[PDB]
Amino acid sequence: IISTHLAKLYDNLLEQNLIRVIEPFSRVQIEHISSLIKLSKADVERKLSQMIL
Amino acid sequence: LLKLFTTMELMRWSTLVEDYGVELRKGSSETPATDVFSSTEEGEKRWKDLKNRVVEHNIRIMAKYYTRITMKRMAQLLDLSVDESEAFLSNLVVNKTIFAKVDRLAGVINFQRPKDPNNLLNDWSQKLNSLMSLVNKTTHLIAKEEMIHNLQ
């Protein structure tokens, strides 16, 4: 019960935080957004990859 | 101080720091009820905060006039570095006061709505509706105007 709850909390957090960095559109570099968002380089690439689909 | 701030014409940060510094920063006065400008203790921080404000004003004015500006060209204008300008734009765009599209590669800043060929056609349709109203009016002024030859 705890795990499920924590998981739902994780998907929402991830989506909220992204919108702010991305917002100019165009070709923002994965690296500049990464710094602002408060994420690591390896983690951001993977999160974005899931998100396109 | 009033004049630069009031014009939407270009200013440059540096010119302002010296210009204001001589005249305005001093803030001599006799009343104890105000002596605040930059002479006071919070006054120091207020001048620090002014860098941010001036540069932001440059962004607003450029958003309207320009539709597309090169990245290189906008950093000079603002008085910011390449990284700083691209970064400062995203914060503004999310916060919603100007809308730019930032290429973090130093390519281009587009203050436009996202270009469509379709978009441009519509803007002409409105102009056309105005253009006809103007042509009907004008014909009348011609008839009174032709009669006279005593006022030349």
Curated annotation (Swiss-Prot), chain A:
Superkingdom in the source lineage: Eukaryota
Transmembrane intervals: none
Location of this chain's protein in the cell: Nucleus; Cytoplasm, Cytosol
UniProt modification remark: Phosphorylated by AMPK.
Subunit: Component of the 19S proteasome regulatory particle complex. The 26S proteasome consists of a 20S core particle (CP) and two 19S regulatory subunits (RP). The regulatory particle is made of a lid composed of 9 subunits including PSMD11, a base containing 6 ATPases and few additional components.
Role, per record: Component of the 26S proteasome, a multiprotein complex involved in the ATP-dependent degradation of ubiquitinated proteins. This complex plays a key role in the maintenance of protein homeostasis by removing misfolded or damaged proteins, which could impair cellular functions, and by removing proteins whose functions are no longer required. Therefore, the proteasome participates in numerous cellular processes, including cell cycle progression, apoptosis, or DNA damage repair. In the complex, PSMD11 is required for proteasome assembly.
Family, similarity comment: Belongs to the proteasome subunit S9 family.
Record's protein name: 26S proteasome non-ATPase regulatory subunit 11
Source organism of the structure: Rattus norvegicus
